[PDB]
Design a protein around this ligand. Structure first.
Ligand code: NI
Length: 245
């Protein structure tokens, strides 16, 4: 039934994941991580918010493996699951920026997202009607590549949304005195195919990595092996992205 909603609407929310306290703790760890990488500078700082946070930070690694999220994603996609990317979407207080309706460009580099991919948008803060939250366009995922079917993604801190990658969406400005933080996770099955180029992903359910070179979890925040794997994987992914545009 979760899959029935997901397939008709192109999304499903709320999905329970973290408690309010888990969400607040993860937000603290995330802001600590951001301060740290801004202090280090360079490659980590540039790529702080995407696309492989889970490979260097423990809080991200811990969210993407959360059993509630993995169970829901399996409900939607099957028992074989990989983490393809992670993103921090942060709208700071009184952020006057808007985002037109659009589809995340990542879909273009993947073949099979139509039936074997989903993005989990975890709320680290609440998402209210005024703090610059995401808006879905119901049914807009059909045919892959309005304003009357817009649905505000309103979540308690710790809950998450799950949407098809062909889902149109927008964001308004954060009209409040508190920054809005969200963590997005791209989950795929081994039946998704990189349209062009070498790619890598992290096995989280099953034993089949498909066409993706297997990544591996950090033993420790910024463990040097994790840092090297991070450089390699982010360079790989950015070559892919550059190629598909
Ligand atoms: Ni987008």
């Amino acid at each position: 039934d979760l899959a029935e909603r997901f397939r008709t609407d192109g999304f499903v929310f709320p999905v329970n994941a973290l408690t309010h306290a888990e969400a607040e703790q993860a937000l603290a760890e995330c802001q600590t991580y951001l301060r740290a990488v801004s202090a280090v500078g360079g490659a980590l700082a540039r790529y702080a918010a995407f696309p492989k946070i889970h490979l260097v930070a423990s809080w991200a690694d811990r969210i993407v493996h959360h059993p509630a999220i993995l169970d829901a994603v399996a409900s939607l996609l099957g028992p074989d699951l990989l983490v393809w990317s992670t993103n921090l979407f942060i709208r700071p207080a009184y952020s006057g920026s808007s985002l037109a309706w659009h589809q995340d460009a990542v879909y273009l580099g993947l073949d099979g997202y139509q039936q074997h991919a989903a993005r989990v948008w975890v709320a680290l803060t609440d998402t209210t009607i005024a703090n610059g939250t995401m808006r879905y366009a119901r049914g807009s995922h059909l045919h892959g590549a309005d304003e009357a079917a817009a649905v505000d993604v309103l979540l308690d801190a710790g809950q998450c949304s799950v949407h098809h990658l062909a889902m149109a969406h927008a964001s308004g400005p954060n009209q409040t005195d508190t920054g809005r933080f969200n963590f997005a996770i791209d989950y795929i099955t081994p039946r998704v195919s990189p349209t062009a180029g070498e790619d890598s992903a992290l096995l989280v359910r099953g034993t089949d990595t498909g066409a993706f070179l297997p990544e591996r979890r950090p033993e420790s925040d910024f463990d040097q092996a994790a840092l090297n794997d991070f450089y390699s994987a982010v360079t790989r992914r950015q070559k892919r992205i550059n190629q598909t545009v």
